[model samples]
Target: PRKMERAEGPASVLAIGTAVPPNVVYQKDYPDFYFGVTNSNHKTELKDKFQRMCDKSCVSKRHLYLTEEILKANPSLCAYWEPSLDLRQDIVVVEVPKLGKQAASAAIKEWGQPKSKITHLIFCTTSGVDMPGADWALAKLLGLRSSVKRLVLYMQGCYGGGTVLRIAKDLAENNKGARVLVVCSEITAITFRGPSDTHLDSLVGQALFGDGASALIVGSDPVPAVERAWFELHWTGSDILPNSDGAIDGHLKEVGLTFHLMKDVPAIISKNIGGILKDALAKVFPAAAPPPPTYNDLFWITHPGGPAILDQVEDRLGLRKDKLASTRAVLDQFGNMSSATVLFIMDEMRKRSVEQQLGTTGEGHEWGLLLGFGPGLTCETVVLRSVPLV
Candidate 1:
C-alpha cells in the first residue's frame, strides 16, 4: 500500500473559541454561597477554613454548571459522602456535549469554513463518560460529516488539552487537506460535594475548579487569504515526574469524582521542570548557532493548574512577573477548568497579542512553549511558533 506523504509544514492553529457556564460565583462570596447551597453552614469552622482558601486562591470568580436551583433539586449531589455517581454521570452526559457544541460553534464560525471541511474530531473532557461518548454527540451537534474520524479522551485531567492538540497535529499533517476540530469541555457538577471535616485537601479543588469549554481548528497548509494560522504546532512531547505518581490523583468512586492534592505537587514540578524544558527545547531546536536559549527567551502558554504551580514555575525558571501575565489572567478569571484550562490560556494570550498590536500571536515572540500538567504528574509540552499577522 502506498503511504500518504506528510504535510509540507507543521500543523497550525487556525482558530480558537472558549465558553463558560452562566452561573458565576465570585470568590469573595463563594464561602457563604457554597456552604449555604450544600447545607453545610452549620459547620462554621470548616466554612472559615474554606473562606481562607478562597481568599488566597488568586481566582476572582468562576462559572459553575451546578446552579443553586440544581443543587437544591439534587440532594445527593451536595452530600459530603453519598452514593451519587449515577446522578453525577447523568448530568454530565447531557451537559458536556451541549457545552462543547457552544465552543465548537464559535471556532467553526471563526474558521470561516463549512462544517464539511472538518475531517477529524477530537473531544476531550474529565467530566463525562458513556458508550457513544461526547465526541460522537459533539460531532452530531455540530452537524459535521458522518464520515468524520472521531476520538474521545475521558479523564485526562489538566493535560488533556495538550494531549488532544498533540494528536491533532499528527492527524492534520498525515492526512492530505485534513482539518481537525478539537474541543475540551469540563463541568464541576461531576465532582461537586459538600464540605467534609476529615478531607481538607478536597477543599482546595472546591475553591479552585470551574466549568468551561474551549475549541480549536487545526490544520496544515491553510488556504491562502481564507484561513488564518495563529500558532504553528512545532513539536509535542510528554514527561512524567519520577516518584510523583500520587501527587495529583483522582478516583471515580460510587460517591463521585474525588480528587486528592498532595502538598508537594508544586515542589515536584519545580524540581523537574527546568530539566524537562531544557531537553524539550534541545530536541526542538537542536544545534542552534547561538546555543540554547534562556527560559525567558521563549514565551510560555502554561496551564494555570493553581496559584502555587504558577508561582513555583516562575520562581524555578527565574521568569519575570510579566512572563506569565496571560496565564495568571486566566487563573484569576476562570480558575481551573481541568483539561479545558490551557486552551483558555492560549485564547487569552492571542487576544492580548492582537489588542497590543504585537506582530506575532505569542506576545511578539516567534518561539514559545505550551505546557500542561495533570494526574500522572504528567507534563505535556508543545513547542509553538507564532504566525505573524498579515
Candidate 2:
C-alpha cells in the first residue's frame, strides 16, 4: 500500500538560461548613435549632457531589440511625446514571448527534461500587455502541455524576477513532482523615447535599460540521476520603504510607458537595506547559535539597477569589492534589463563558480542573498544556500 508523495525539501533552482537581442550598442558610441537615430543632434547641450551620462554609466555595452532600422521605420516611437503606446504594445505582444521562448528552450535543454515534464509556467514582463498574454504565447511556442498551470505577471518592473522565483518556490513545493519554468523578459522598445530636457529622470532609463530574457527551472526534491540543484531557496521576504511609493513610478499612456525616478531612491534604499537584511536573516536563521551572520559572510546577487544603487548598497553594507563583482559584471555587459537582469546575474555567478571549481554554486560561499529593487520602492530578498557541485 502506497500513499501520495510530497517533496521532502525546499524548492531549488535547477537550471538557468539568459538571452539578449542581436543588436549590440557599445556605451562609448551610444550617445552618437542615440542622438543620430532620434535626429536630436541639433541640441548640442543635451548631446553633451547625455555623453557625460553615458560615460559615467559603468556599462561597457548593451543589447537592444530596438535597432536603428526599427527606430527609423517607426518615427512615432522616436518622438518624446508622441502617441505610440498602441504600436509599442503591438510589437511587444509578438516579440516578448519570442524572446522568452529562446531562453526557456535553453533552460529546458540544461534541465535535460522533455517539454512535457514542465508542469507549471510562470511568465513575467514589463513590456507586454495583451489578451492571451506572453504566458500563453510562450507556452505555445515551447509546446508545453495544455494542462500546464500558467501565471502571468505584468508591469512588475525590476523586482519581477525575484517575485516569480518566490512564486515558483511555492508552486513547486506544494505540488508533487512539479517542475516550474519561470521566465522574465524585458524590452526597452515599449519605453524608448528621445531625450527631453524637462524629463531628465527618463534619461536614466534610456541610458541604462537594455533587452534580455531569462528562464529557470525550479522544483523541490531533485531526481537523483537527472536533476541538479544549483541554489536551494531558503527564505523569502519583501519590504516597501515607507513613503517611497513615488520614488519609482511608471504609467502606460498614449505616449508609451512613462516613468519617474525620484532623486532620493538611492538614498532610501541605502537607508533601509540593512534593516531589511537583518529582519530577513532573523527569520531564515531563527535561534542562531553564532548570532546573526554579518553582511560580509554571504555572497550577494543584487539587482544592478544602476551604479548608484549598487554603489550605495556596497557602501552601506561595508561589503568587500568582490562580493558584487558578478552583479557589476552583468551591469557592464547587459546594462539593466529590468526584471530579467537578476536572473542573468545568477546565471553569470554559477558559470564563474563552476569554471573556478568553487565547491558551491554561490561563488564558493554556502549562503547568499538575492535582492531585487523596483517600483513600490520595493525590495525583494531571498535567502539561498548554494548546492555544492561535488
Candidate 3:
C-alpha cells in the first residue's frame, strides 16, 4: 500500500451534530397520508403501484415539521398536490430556521465552543425561502456573534453540504483561529407529491424525499478536543454535467417548489462519476498520479439519492453492492433529505466508527471519499485523511 500525506493547512472537522423534526412518520403509512391529502387514489391500480414504490423506497420512516396529528386533522395541509406556495412560504418562515437552530445548537454544544467564538456561519438550504433568509433567522435564533461573517447558500440542492465544507475550509485556512459553523437544513416533505400526479417525474421524488437538518464545526484546531478527529477536509472540487442543461429543474408553482426529475437522471449522473473522481484525485492525491488510484482502502460516503444511484456507483467503481451500507441505511431510515441528507450519512458513519472501536486515536491511515449529487447534475467531492495529534 502507498502512503498519502495530508494537504497542508486544511481545516479539520471538529465535531458534528444533527436534528430532525418531531413529526416522525413511517414509510409504510405514507399511502394513507398521501391519498388523504391529494385525493389522488381515485384509481385502485395507480394507488397500488404508488404504494409499491413507497415500499421500494427502503425508507422506514422520516420526520417532518408538519406534525402527524396536524396533517391528520387537515389532510389538505400536506405539501401534496396543491398546498399553495404562499402557505408553504409561511410555514418555511416559521419552521426552517427553528430546525436549523436546533441542529446548530447541538453541534455547538458538541464542539463546546461558545456562540461568540464562532467567527463564521455558512448555511445551506433549497427547500424554502423568504425575506430575512434562513441565515438571517439562524443568526438571531442562535445568538451568533454580531461580527461573524455569514454565507447563505440557496438552491445548491443535495450537493450543498459539500459546498459549505469547501467555503468553510477556505475561510478557516485564510483567517487565523477561525471557527466555522456550517448548517444544512431542508423541509422537503412540504413540497410533497405522489405517483398519481400530472408530472410523471414527481413519483420518484415523492417516494424518496424527506426533511432534515445537520450541522458541523470546522476549524484549524492544532490540538483537537477529542482523542481523535473524524476527518480533515483536505480538498474539494465540483463538476457540472455536460449536455445536462435541462436535465433537472426546480420551478415555483402555485402549489409549492416543483422539481422535474427526468427518467434518465441516474444514468446521466452515473456517466460522469468516474471522470469526476479521477479529476478530483488528480488534484488532491497527486502521489497516486497515475490513473485509477486504489479505492478499496477508502471508505465512500456517497449521496443515497435512490437505490439506482447507489447501484450505479458500485457498478462503475467495481465494488460490491454492500460497499454503501451506511448510505443504504440512511436512505432506509430517512429517504432522500436533499441538501441535508449527506451530512446525516456522515453522522451515521461517525457513529459507526465509534461503535466499531475506531476513534481519533489516530492509529490507522483512515481515508474517506465524500460524494454528493444534485442539480446541474453536479458531482461534488471532498478528500479526507485522518491524523494522530500527539
Candidate 4:
C-alpha cells in the first residue's frame, strides 16, 4: 500500500464559500418586468432566437440584475446555495475599493469560519481579464503564505469549476499537508450592453447569468478526515473541441466582457458528450463502463448549464428525474454564475451531508460525479468521491 496513514484533519470538504449579486433578474419574467429591454435592433429574430435557445438549452429561467447590484446584494439560490455579491459601476474603470480582493475575502471569511488553516489557493473565473488576477490580491490581503503558489485560469466558461476541482486533486496527491482553497468570482452581469444589444440572446444572458463567486476549501489535512471526506477525485477526463472558436467566445470589447455564442451549443454537447462520457468513463473507471450511466443507479450534480442543457443530460444519461431541481433553482435565483455553479451543486451535496443522507449510501466512496461545460465548447468532467470524516 502507498502509506495511507491516519489523516490529521477530516480531509473532506471542511466548508464552502459563496458570493453572488444582489438582484434576481428572472429570464422568463424579463419581458414582463422590463418589456422594452428585449428586442433591440431586430425584435422578432431575437425573440425567436431566445425561445429556441431557451428551449434547446432547457435554461428555463436565468437570473439578471442591475450591474450596480454587484457591490450590494445577497441572494439565495434555492435552499442549498446562498451567496453574497455586490456590484459597483466602478468595477468597469479598473480602480476601486472592491475588485476581486473583496470577493475573495468575503468567500474566504465564509468558509474559513471555524478558522481552519487554509493552505492552497485555486482561483477561477470567465469574466473580465485582469493582471495580478485575484489570487495575488487575495493572498496579500489575508496575509497567507507568500510562498503560497497561485493557480489562475480565466475565460473558460460555465464548466470552469471542473477545472478547479481537477487541479485541487492534483495538489492534494502531490503535496503533503496541503490544504487548498478555490475561489471563483464571475461577473457575467457586467457584460450588459445597455438597451441596444437587447436581443433575445440578451435576455438569455440577462436571466441566466449573474455576478457571483464561490470559494471552496479542500485538502489532505486541517479539517479532520471523517467529516472532511466530501469526495475523492478518482479520475478526470477533458476534451476541448477545436474548429469552433465562435461556438463560445469571450472577448474584451469596447463595452465589456461580451461573448458571441453560436446557436448550436446544446446540440453540439448532446451529440458529442454522450459518446465522450461513455469513452471517458471507460478510461477513468473502466470497470464501471458497459452498462454505463443508468437512471435508476447513478444520481447527478451536472451543471445547471441552463434549462435545456439539464434536460439533455437528464435524457442522455437517464439520471434521476428529480436530481436537477437544485441547479434549476440556482439559475432561477442566482443565474449562470459561470464556474461557481458546481460549488452551488456542492452546496446541495453538503447540505445532504448534514442530514447524513450522504457519507453512508452510494458505494465504497459514496459520492456522485461532477459535470461542467465551458468555452471551446469544452466538456470537463470529473469523478469526485463523497468521502467524509464519519
Query: What's the true lDDT of residue 81 in model 1?
Result: 86
Which 10 residues in a row give candidate 3 its minimum summed lDDT? 1-10
Clashes of each: 0, 0, 1, 41
Pairs that collide, model 3: 228-360
Cα lDDT for residue 80, model 4? 13
Backbone steric clashes in candidate 1, count: 0
Candidate 4: deviation at residue 176, Å? 0.3
Worst 10 residues of 2 by lDDT: 1-10
TM-score of every candidate relative to the true structure: 0.98, 0.98, 0.90, 0.76
- The sequence of per-residue lDDT tens digits that candidate 3 reaches over residues 351-386 is 766566664322233666778888887778888776
For model 4, what is the C-alpha lDDT against the true structure? Answer: 0.59
lDDT of all predictions, in order shown? 0.91, 0.91, 0.76, 0.59
The per-residue C-alpha lDDT of model 4 at residue 179 equals 69
Q: State the lDDT of candidate 2 residue by residue for 284-390, as single tens digits.
A: 77793556677887889999988998889899989998999999999999999999999999999999999999888998888999999999999999899998877
List the candidate 3 regions with Cα displacement exceeding 4 Å.
1-8, 72-83, 193-197, 224-228, 287-293, 359-365, 387-390
Worst 10 residues of 1 by lDDT: 288-297
The residue ranges of model 4 lying beyond 4 angstroms of the native Cα positions read 1-12, 26-29, 32-116, 195-203, 221-227, 242-245, 287-296, 356-365, 388-390
- Whole-model lDDT, candidate 2? 0.91
Residue-wise C-alpha lDDT for candidate 1, range 1-390, written one tens digit per residue: 338666767899999999899888999889998899889989999999998899989999999998889989999988988999999999999999999999999999999999899999999999969989999999888889999999999989999988998999999999889999999999988899999978989988999999999999999999998999999998888998999979999998899899988998899998899999889888876883455567787788899888999899999889999999998899899999989998998999989999999888999888998999999899999899997754
